[model samples]
Target: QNRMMKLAYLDRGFYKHYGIIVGDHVYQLDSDDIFKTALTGKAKFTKTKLTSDWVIEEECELDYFRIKYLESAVDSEHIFSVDKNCETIAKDIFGTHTLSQHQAIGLVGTILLTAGLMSTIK
Candidate 1:
């Protein structure tokens, strides 16, 4: 529950943020700050951090989230979703290990759809 407070605090700056608490684990949505241009500025659940003992043990970015991110960015007015540009951004931040469009979209869909379903169920 302590971690939930941190998650809530960190996420409040953005218009959209999501989180989940399953058993003793807490999950918070985060993203690579480098991707915060005007076009790709939508809140993305690209990174997931798990916490226990009020400490973050692991933070990982999901490939599928990146893919969905590309789709959304491409459809945006500015067309910031171009592969070449995004690759440069990714390299600058992540230093390789980027996710393809298909993989990222798939993962993003799963996480968001599941969250939607959770809301509907409530």
Candidate 2:
């Protein structure tokens, strides 16, 4: 049997990819860089990547996730969407989503810079 599903996540460097773990395999929408994703995106035709480095997240399924992947994969304008992306797709797979830590810090950094600059502008 394949076994109970696992909602796993992979965080390598400044990016994260989500997928479902089944036994020795993890099914995920494997992506490289934003540009390779064609800028807008290609989650659907992007071709799935099966790797073995995910940290187990939660218990999860197969067909269900595949379908969810299908829907989310078809989406475009990835980073530009400001919401939906690889993480969102994974979250949505399990009926879920969140922002990457880099994006989080990046936003904070911008806000901090903007605030500090306000005083300088004066």
Candidate 3:
């Protein structure tokens, strides 16, 4: 059987996108036009389409050095809290307390993955 995983969507103010975190890899959905609409307020914000055939447009992987960097920064206990954990993770990864456009999206994806929120498709 082919194992399919459903990813989560991250929508930060000023930017929005979908991402799926698997193992050490983060698969990002391509949603440039969707982001533009949310930013400009020209259209209603909508979630990315993650149907049965959803394709990963981009992939971001954490290198060994980066993983070690995060391991040093993030406390294991903080992973359960969404806001605090995301803030801490984002800061450590991107060097900022507040999540940037891309950082927020990526962080949320990671959070979902770690939390076991991703669904298994048969």
Candidate 4:
């Protein structure tokens, strides 16, 4: 099994992603910076809670997910896992269906990572 599949959580806007929690540490996803570093390898994560609810008094705690970089791999499948959730979001956002996780991540990652690298060119 790929131990690199493990992730870490950071105290950021991870709520936009997986909304499940185990405790004060999120079981998936990390801060933006964490994702960037994780691209190179594994990730470290933490958990947090959601304290407020809009238009309601029922305040619920959320498991903030994040990732911590552990190691690196040349395998593409490892990177494709990141799209599992993003695909869900796309379906909701576009009000459409039948989007494959692999395609979504592949296209998006190519564009994003390319732009990301360009910023560092010097």
Candidate 5:
């Protein structure tokens, strides 16, 4: 009864990566494969500050719901728009919040070691 969508946060020093944890496994949405699982290495889960929607069977719905996020820039390297990144995917999977908070986190990380967040031309 405590099942929930956990956003796996992987902020490797000055960079960030994201994955969805509907269960014990991590579901990392990659531009190469759309989704990958069980990605370990200094990984963490979503914060308690945000809403955690209770889910009974999340896997079935995740693939169905994840369709909207298959745009581009699964990484933070591409900063054309913040809407279509890994953090956005994780946040969307959790419950669809706005992009301001993610920008907040990224900015702080950049201040730490100084990092990247620039656009690439198509």
Candidate 6:
């Protein structure tokens, strides 16, 4: 089965940052010192790095953007039903479920993308 993966977006003032969330961690492009030194004034860029709990994978440079990324995967199971009353039913039976407002929004976004009704937002 395909593991549940979601896209994460972070606002970095000058531009938006994007990442992929697998399990509890997120993988994204890293910020390097060379790029920071080239920035004018005190404009700071968000530093993306793999901490103690993270992993490093690949790097790519395109135009002025330098992209370094870490990629990893984990196994997961579809534990919740996607029925009309899925959230309600799951709450009543298990006392809780992973469904959340953001998750619902992502689901809708996925549907729109699949139908070709919505263009990429990021």
Which one is best on TM-score?
Answer: 2
Model 2 lDDT at residue 101: 38
Give the per-residue lDDT digits (tens) of candidate 1, residues 1-122: 33222222123233333343323543333343323422343343333344432332135333223233443543442222222234444553466566566444433333433333334332
Q: Alpha-carbon error at 108 in model 5, in Å?
A: 23
Q: Tens digits of per-residue lDDT for model 2 on 1-122?
A: 15555555666663555555556655444344434433443332222344556666554333332333333433541222322344444454454355443333223222222222233332
Instruction: Give all candidate RMSDs, comma-separated.
Output: 13.1, 12.4, 13.3, 11.5, 14.3, 17.1
* Deviation in Å, model 5, residue 49 alpha carbon: 24
- Positional deviation of 47 in candidate 5, in angstroms? 20
State the lDDT of candidate 6 residue by residue for 1-122, as single tens digits.
Answer: 02334444443333434444444555333322323322321111122332333322225211111122112111221121112234544453357456553333233223222222112233
Return the number of clashes found in candidate 1: 7
Better candidate number, 1 or 4, judged by TM-score: 1
Question: lDDT value for candidate 1?
Answer: 0.36
By lDDT, is 3 or 6 better? 3
Compared with the true structure, the alpha-carbon lDDT of candidate 4 equals 0.32
Top model by lDDT, which number?
Answer: 2
Question: What lDDT is obtained when candidate 6 is compared to the true structure?
Answer: 0.31
- Distance from true location, Cα of 71 in model 4, Å: 20
lDDT per residue as tens, model 4, 6-68: 222122222223322332332333335534643553322223453332111124421111122
| Evaluation by TM-score, superior candidate among 4 and 5 | 5
TM-score of each: 0.26, 0.39, 0.23, 0.24, 0.27, 0.26
Error of 2 at 102 (Å): 31
Q: Candidate 3: deviation at residue 4, Å?
A: 14
Worst 10 residues of 6 by lDDT: 61-70
